[PDB]
């Protein structure tokens, strides 16, 4: 049955609550983004209204076959009215089409649901600047101080320089990038752009990326693996057996793979700067784990909350153990004491 932290009080709304059947007294189902832990349970047989971004709606229609009459896409940064409640969708800086949702309840309470997000100081200049928030439903994925990571831009610089150098030294090398859900597209697109190649992939992955409004996508992606020197594969195939196998299938077109696994965090970041990262190598296969995160680091999260100064924080991640919950509540107290609210 539905957890309390997926329910918006004083409304008939839920957020990312599609694996519970018919939720008692839910009139409208919001979806923050197209990742499987959040959409789990949608299908062509779903007949309640779903509210979401334009991109997420494209994906519901095309990938899950949800019927068009039940998809209610909203533009960003725009006051809209749902079942008599004013709502706004804000960019979450997560994956394509991911949003945070602002709710303005009839009694004057204001609620922000972050969905999944990576906090950034650019958010301190949206419709959030203009008013107070009583309740924050917060993405606490990395809510512990050991989670530090570089900026996405520093990680992309590292990957582009690495791939450029490798292929210049060996023009018969193949670059591989692992993927398991939408998100992290800049990794593979930036690499392809510096090598003057398209990114090759399965027809199903190509179809998924065409659902996204990426300007000049016919331009960056293809299903012709032959013409391409950057290939996308399932994250699971990013290991030595998977990559030897793939290398065989290219029919002596390539003699080496350099592969990137853009993971969230790895305990190497406690003892290593981005500049000092190295691969795992076996034969003519090298694998780099790079800390490209689409969630807030601990310090990014803390700054965002100390700026917003919500009256109450409800964590939405890591809530299933008493020790995790207590640890997060202790941080939230420090933040409030340090910030003076």
Minimum CB distance to Ni ion, residue 181 (Å): 7
Asked whether the beta carbons of 180 and 234 are under 8 A apart, the reply is: yes
Which of 35/246 has CB closer to Ni ion? 35
Alpha carbons 195 and 254: distance in angstroms, whole number: 15
Which of 5/164 has CB closer to Ni ion? 5
Minimum CB distance to Ni ion, residue 179 (Å): 14
Q: Exposed e or buried b for every residue in 98-110, given b needs 16+ CB within 10 A?
A: bbbbbbbbeeebb
The one segment of 15-23, 115-123, 150-158, 331-339 that binds Ni ion by CB under 5 A: 115-123
Minimum CB distance to Ni ion, residue 66 (Å): 19
Minimum CB distance to Ni ion, residue 94 (Å): 6
Minimum CB distance to Ni ion, residue 70 (Å): 22
- In whole angstroms, how far apart are CA 317 and each of 113, 140, 192? 12, 5, 34
The closest alpha carbon to 174, from 235, 241, 246, belongs to 246
The one segment of 32-40, 48-56, 214-222, 275-283 that binds Ni ion by CB under 5 A: 32-40
> Contacting Ni ion (CB under 5 A), which of 8, 56, 116, 119?
116
Radius of gyration in angstroms for the set of CA atoms belonging to the chain, rounded to a whole number:
22
Q: Does 185 bind Ni ion (CB under 5 A)?
A: no
Which of 92/163 has CB closer to Ni ion? 92
Q: Does 303 bind Ni ion (CB under 5 A)?
A: no
The one segment of 27-35, 170-178, 246-254, 324-332 that binds Ni ion by CB under 5 A: 27-35
> Contacting Ni ion (CB under 5 A), which of 11, 31, 32, 35?
35
Query: Taking CB positions, which residue lies at the least distance from Ni ion?
Result: 116
Asked whether the beta carbons of 14 and 30 are under 8 A apart, the reply is: yes
Minimum CB distance to Ni ion, residue 116 (Å): 4
Cα angle value 235/238/243 (rounded, 5°): 135
Asked whether the beta carbons of 42 and 19 are under 8 A apart, the reply is: no
Q: Is the dihedral of CA 51, 52, 54, 59 positive or negative?
A: negative
Q: What single DSSP character describes residue 205?
A: H
Residues that bind Ni ion (CB under 5 A): 35, 116
């Amino acid at each position: 049955t539905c957890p309390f932290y997926k329910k918006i009080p004083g409304t008939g709304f839920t957020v990312d609550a599609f694996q519970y059947g018919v939720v008692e007294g839910c009139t409208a189902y919001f979806l923050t983004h197209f990742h499987s832990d959040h959409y789990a349970g949608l299908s062509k047989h779903f007949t309640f209204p779903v509210y979401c971004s334009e991109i997420t709606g494209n994906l519901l229609k095309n990938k899950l076959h949800v019927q068009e009459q039940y998809i209610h896409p909203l533009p960003l940064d725009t006051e809209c009215i749902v079942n008599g409640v004013k709502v706004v969708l804000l960019d979450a800086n997560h994956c394509p089409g991911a949003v945070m949702i602002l709710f303005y309840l009839p009694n004057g309470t204001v609620i922000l649901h972050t969905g999944d997000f990576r906090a950034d100081p650019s958010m301190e200049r949206s419709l959030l600047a203009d008013q107070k928030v009583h309740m924050l439903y917060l993405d606490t994925t990395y809510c512990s101080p050991e989670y530090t990571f570089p900026s996405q831009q520093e990680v992309i610089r590292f990957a582009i320089n690495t791939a450029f150098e490798a292929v210049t030294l060996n023009p018969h090398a193949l670059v591989v990038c692992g993927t398991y859900s939408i998100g992290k597209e800049k990794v593979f697109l930036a690499i392809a752009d510096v090598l003057g190649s398209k990114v090759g992939m399965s027809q199903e992955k190509y179809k998924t990326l065409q659902c996204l409004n990426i300007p000049e996508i016919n331009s960056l992606i293809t299903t012709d693996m032959c013409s391409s020197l950057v290939h996308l594969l399932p994250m699971m195939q990013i290991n030595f057996k998977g990559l030897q196998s793939h290398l065989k299938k290219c029919g002596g077109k390539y003699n080496q793979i350099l592969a990137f696994r853009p993971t969230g965090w790895t305990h190497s970041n406690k003892f290593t700067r981005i500049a000092d990262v190295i691969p795992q190598t076996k034969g003519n296969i090298s694998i780099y784990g790079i800390p490209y995160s689409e969630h807030s680091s601990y310090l990014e999260m803390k700054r965002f909350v100390q700026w917003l100064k919500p009256q109450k924080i409800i964590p939405t991640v890591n809530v299933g153990t008493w020790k995790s919950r207590s640890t997060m509540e202790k941080y939230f107290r420090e933040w409030k004491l340090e910030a003076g609210y």
